[PDB]
Design a protein around this ligand. Structure first.
Ligand SMILES: Nc1ncnc2c1ncn2[C@@H]1O[C@H](COP(=O)(O)OP(=O)(O)OP(=O)(O)O)[C@@H](O)[C@H]1O
Ligand SMILES: Nc1ncnc2c1ncn2[C@@H]1O[C@H](COP(=O)(O)OP(=O)(O)OP(=O)(O)O)[C@@H](O)[C@H]1O
Ligand SMILES: [Mg+2]
Ligand SMILES: [Mg+2]
Lengths: 464, 507, 47, 114
């Protein structure tokens, strides 16, 4: 039978049930706020059993107006979200309730958002490259089809622009289906993405799930699993190739930290939940691709205080095949997509996979940029002039390599006005091979800003 | 035993009702009783002070006291107000200074609030919004040219102490008088200036500036000065957001300034540490991002189904020593749709406002900038980004190319063009012409030091002689080729008769 | 003359680097103090 | 000086002086360059590097580290070795002559080997 709310601490609610009817973990409970201004059917999720039939639950809607003593009914099953080809082209919240038309999806097949990740026997590594048309990614951080990809960055470096750029590159011509999870991001960007996908006609092939900023930590941490359930349905049942964009996955751990401090759990190193690794792994080990059915995933990761040693990025690094670490220093130079060529990495940049022509060029570029980073001190104090001639030439071409990695992205059209460009992988390899050999050391350095190609590079060199 | 359970239930169900304080200190009180109190209900204590029932424990209710917590003591009776945390709202709040609970503190009479609004209502969903389409003319040349603000946008003014932030916000509020006088709700802008943690004298000076400029006919101040406890400094931004939201959902356009959200973050840190919530980064709780995002996310451009209203947020973040990479600044940047970084280094050198181009950006702008202003200002941002690198390069290079010197001389005039005095917002009609003067090189013939005058004297001259240009910019919203030719004719005519400080001929 | 100009530039760059590193050192100092306080009071709040 | 002697104390304190000066010159050397130093500071840097390398020693219980056998340098021989070094008596020998070498005789042998 029904329970009784005993303790309310922000978005966390303790509910006492009878002796034997205590609900299971992750069960969905319902309470009612009856205050007229904001009355609603509150949804709670059982998180802990505290003894004496008490269970502590995480609220999905904000717990305002809730009164101690209100009856709480347990659905007997975890939070469920709709699944099927129907969810494509619609906008859902963390609880599976449709937004663009609220009557949608309550008759579809419903899947629990909590599941164990696929068995180890079904996993096999993905070593197929995914040409995105971006020089920096295609050269130094080659993405993996069916593999997890991360775009790390602080505030204002271009993570969201990159995510929508890769929606342009990958999703807009993708054969299968896509899913987008707005976790702790702006409702403004969610609406913008919705209209953009509607205009590009990619909406019909994508299911959008939003847990945006204005929502309490509960939904802000269960929205990722809600979207991942639809992705896993399209993976396991339909057999479709799946894309899964998640912006931003750090907000999942941040909401985890909030709920952890509210649940009474002792804080970890810098205030995060002690189970940061456990929860993060439970989420990102379900985003994996199995043997015969691929789920490409691209996750924007926020790096608080630009500190790349923060426990959340530190934990989420281990769950990635390709990592694109955007950096403030590159951003300040105007070198967009703003990737740090040295801090980024990919698990398929080995010569057995990308070829030795690609690998040799990438390693030479990384060597030049590492030498430039090492000389940064002398550059800062004295300048380029006091270096050795070898190092002076190396720096003069390192700056050009660094700027040539910039590209006029498609998504940049709304900001720069310039149209975007796509550079095929072969042209990128040839261009950077020429750059590392010194074949372009005479052109001015500005001829490389946001240029995207050898032919267009020659065009801009003629322009200057 | 089970009859026991049953009569226990009788008692539980048995559960105009009064609580009693059993613990109080530093802004946190605990109230036994009130079995029916709602979470975040507004509790009333005998001295007239109010608290917010955050914690609802099995034994007691932990309430954060808003106001004079020194008046609270053990044994006092606490009364339900029956209202979830809410503030009165209505059109009567215009021109009134009110503390975060809507209680006037300007010395005038009471406020005839239309209704109450809960401070913790959800922001418009993903499907209830629409991309911003009309500009919020700040009256500042730098902002309106390089980082425009559109109605429904969250623009983050960010900079060190004494760097021109409140000046920019007050200029933005003042510039809305020309829109207010129209009387059209689809063009009017109603302002709400939430002062969090500011000196009382600063708020008094802001009210004086708004009164002199006529901005108090449509501007409401929510004042939580440094004097007031952490409670008011915590919920003052939410009071401003509720006041603004009431107008936003009635089809009206709102502009909410939060001065400063760094001081609200500190107040929330104080409240959460007094509640013993384990701190996180920089001693802040893990949900400070939730505080600020829950706040700013309600500033939205509603869809035509919900009246098409808007609320434009202008949060102010006081960085420390230009540490834009700090925790709170980065959080608010990740929340907002752009930042106007007022650098202190420029602020001391007389570059006023000290907008740092390049770093400063309006993510959602461009789509919310009038056609003529976009046409004239397109090259401006790139030109100033180049200049400010060329300025440093030139100081140490022995000599420069004639083209590089031309770029330097153009930038040294563009920067002076964007230089602007306080409390003197320019209508977009004058902003487009001013930027046209410099972007098209008409200032090249003018010495740098006199540009500020040559601009102003021209704008007045046109306003007195060739108002056709300004009227055309108002009505058509584009500097048409006919109007552009007329404008260049007037520019040349003025130049001949424009004196210089050194007496040189600018022709 | 070029040496004088280059050394003035180097002195200015070194002063700016000193200022930036002093800001970074102060931020790290405050962060370490806060982290130490967090550990200490986490241990008290457990005991 | 009252316990170890007045020649031991002088040699040790001069070695400390030289090493401290070469720890304050290291940053300049790394960024500006050794040529930019004064003549006295340049010669002091040479002495300091040789002194650092001579303070190293092939210890007997670390033949699994270096292969070569150990060595014991009597105190008097050490204090004369370092008195010579601080006075530039060995400024002409290469730096490597002083590395992991146990005393003056072994120093001469290694210098002749190089
Ligand atoms: N390629 C580009 N060209 C022009 N401007 C760009 C480019 N990339 C980024 N910007 C500017 O920087 C802003 C960065 O936006 P974005 O939301 O992608 O950044 P983020 O801080 O990493 O993300 P978020 O705030 O969503 O976590 C863009 O809105 C635009 O203002
Ligand atoms: N555009 C401007 N032109 C001239 N003076 C200005 C301008 N903007 C601000 N000032 C002056 O600079 C000083 C500080 O300005 P302001 O009050 O805007 O700073 P702030 O960044 O808001 O500081 P605070 O920390 O006090 O809020 C005041 O003397 C103000 O008059
Ligand atoms: Mg983002
Ligand atoms: Mg101020």
């Amino acid at each position: 039978t029904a329970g009784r709310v005993v303790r309310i601490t922000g978005p966390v609610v303790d509910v006492e049930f009878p002796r034997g009817s205590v609900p299971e973990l992750f069960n969905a409970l319902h309470a009612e706020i009856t205050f007229g201004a904001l009355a609603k059917t509150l949804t709670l999720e059982v998180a802990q059993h505290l003894g004496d039939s008490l269970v502590r639950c995480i609220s999905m809607q904000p717990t305002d107006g809730l009164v101690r003593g209100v009856e709480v009914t347990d659905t007997g099953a975890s939070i469920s979200v709709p699944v099927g080809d129907g969810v494509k082209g619609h906008v859902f919240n963390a609880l599976g309730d449709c937004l663009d038309d609220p009557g949608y999806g309550k008759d579809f097949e419903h899947w629990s958002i909590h599941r164990k990740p696929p068995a180890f026997s079904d996993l096999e590594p993905r070593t197929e490259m995914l040409e995105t048309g971006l020089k920096v990614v295609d050269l130094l951080t080659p993405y993996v089809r069916g593999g997890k990809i991360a775009l790390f960055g602080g505030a204002g470096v271009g993570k969201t622009v990159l995510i929508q750029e890769m929606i342009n590159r990958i999703a807009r011509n993708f054969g299968g289906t896509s899913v987008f999870a707005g976790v702790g991001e702006r409702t403004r960007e969610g609406n913008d993405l919705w209209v953009e996908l509607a205009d590009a006609n990619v909406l019909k092939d994508t299911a959008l799930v939003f847990g945006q900023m204005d929502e309490p930590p509960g939904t802000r941490m269960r929205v990722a699993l809600s979207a991942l359930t639809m992705a896993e349905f399209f993976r396991d049942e339909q057999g479709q190739d799946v894309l899964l964009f998640i912006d931003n996955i750090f907000r999942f751990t941040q909401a985890g930290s909030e709920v952890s401090t509210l649940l009474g759990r002792m804080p970890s190193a810098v205030g995060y939940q002690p189970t940061l690794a456990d929860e993060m792994g439970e989420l990102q080990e379900r985003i994996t691709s199995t043997r015969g059915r691929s789920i490409t995933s691209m996750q924007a990761v926020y790096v608080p205080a630009d500190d790349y040693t923060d426990p959340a990025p530190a934990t989420t690094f281990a769950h990635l095949d390709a990592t694109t670490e955007l950096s403030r220093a590159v951003f300040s130079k105007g070198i967009f997509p703003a990737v740090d060529p040295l801090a980024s990495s990919s698990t398929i940049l080995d010569p057995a996979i990308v070829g030795d022509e690609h690998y040799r060029v990438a390693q030479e570029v990384i060597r030049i940029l590492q030498r430039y980073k090492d000389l940064q001190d002398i550059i800062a104090i004295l300048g380029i002039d006091e270096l050795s001639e070898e190092d002076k030439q190396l720096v003069n071409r390192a700056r050009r390599i660094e700027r040539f990695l910039s590209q006029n992205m498609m998504a940049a059209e709304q900001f720069t006005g310039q149209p975007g460009s796509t550079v095929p992988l072969k042209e990128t390899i040839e261009a950077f091979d020429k750059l590392t050999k010194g074949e372009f050391d005479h052109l001015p350095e500005q001829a490389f800003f946001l240029i995207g190609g050898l032919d267009d590079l020659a065009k801009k060199a003629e322009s200057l | 035993a089970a009859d026991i359970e049953g009569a226990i239930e009788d008692y539980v169900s048995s559960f105009e009702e009064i609580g009693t304080v059993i613990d109080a200190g530093d802004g946190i009180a605990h109230v036994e009783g009130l079995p029916s109190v709602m979470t975040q209900e507004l509790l009333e204590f005998p001295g007239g002070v109010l608290g917010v029932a955050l914690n609802l424990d099995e034994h007691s209710v932990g309430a954060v006291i808003l106001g004079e917590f020194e008046k609270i003591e053990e044994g006092q009776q606490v009364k339900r107000t029956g209202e979830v945390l809410s503030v009165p709202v209505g059109d009567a709040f215009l021109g009134r200074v009110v503390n975060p609970l809507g209680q006037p503190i300007d010395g005038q009479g009471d406020i005839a609030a239309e209704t109450r609004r809960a401070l913790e209502l959800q922001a418009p969903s993903v499907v209830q919004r629409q991309s911003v389409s009309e500009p919020l003319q700040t009256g500042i040349k730098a902002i309106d040219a390089m980082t425009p603000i559109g109605r429904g946008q969250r623009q983050l003014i960010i900079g060190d102490r004494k760097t021109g932030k409140t000046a920019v916000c007050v200029d933005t509020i003042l510039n809305q008088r020309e829109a207010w006088l129209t009387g059209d709700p689809k063009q009017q802008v109603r302002c709400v200036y939430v002062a969090i943690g500011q000196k009382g004298t600063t708020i008094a000076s802001v009210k004086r500036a708004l009164e002199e400029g006529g901005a108090m006919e449509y501007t409401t101040i929510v004042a939580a000065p440094a004097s007031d406890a952490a409670g008011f400094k915590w919920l003052a931004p939410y009071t401003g957001s509720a006041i603004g939201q009431h107008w936003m959902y009635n089809g009206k356009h709102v502009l909410i300034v939060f001065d400063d959200l760094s001081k609200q973050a500190d107040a929330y840190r104080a409240i959460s540490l007094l509640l013993r919530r384990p701190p996180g980064r920089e001693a802040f709780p893990g949900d400070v991002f939730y505080l600020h995002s829950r706040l700013l996310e309600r500033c939205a451009k509603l869809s035509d189904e919900l009246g098409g209203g808007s609320m434009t947020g202008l949060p102010i973040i006081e960085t420390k020593a230009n540490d834009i990479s700090a925790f709170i600044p980065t959080n608010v940047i990740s929340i907002t749709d752009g930042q106007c970084f007022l650098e202190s280094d420029l602020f001391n050198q007389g570059v006023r406002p000290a907008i740092n181009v390049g770093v400063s950006v309006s993510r959602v702008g461009g789509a919310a900038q009038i056609k003529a202003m976009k046409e004239v200002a397109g090259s401006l941002r790139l030109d100033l980004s180049q200049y400010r690198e060329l300025e440093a390069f030139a100081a140490f290079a022995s000599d420069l190319d004639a083209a590089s010197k031309a770029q330097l001389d153009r930038g040294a005039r563009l920067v002076e063009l964007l230089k602007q005095p306080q409390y003197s917002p320019l209508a977009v009609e004058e902003q487009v012409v001013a930027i046209f003067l410099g972007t098209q090189g008409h200032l090249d013939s003018v010495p740098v030091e006199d540009v500020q005058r040559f601009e102003s004297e021209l704008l007045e001259h046109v306003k007195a002689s060739h108002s056709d240009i300004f009227d055309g910019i108002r009505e058509t919203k584009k500097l048409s080729e006919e109007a552009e030719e007329k404008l260049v004719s007037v520019i040349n005519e003025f130049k001949k008769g424009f004196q210089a400080s050194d007496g040189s001929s600018v022709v | 003359a070029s040496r004088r100009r280059a050394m003035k530039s180097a002195t200015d760059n070194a002063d700016d680097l000193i200022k930036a590193l002093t800001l970074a050192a102060n931020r790290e100092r405050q962060a370490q103090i806060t982290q130490e306080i967090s550990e200490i009071v986490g241990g008290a709040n457990a005991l």
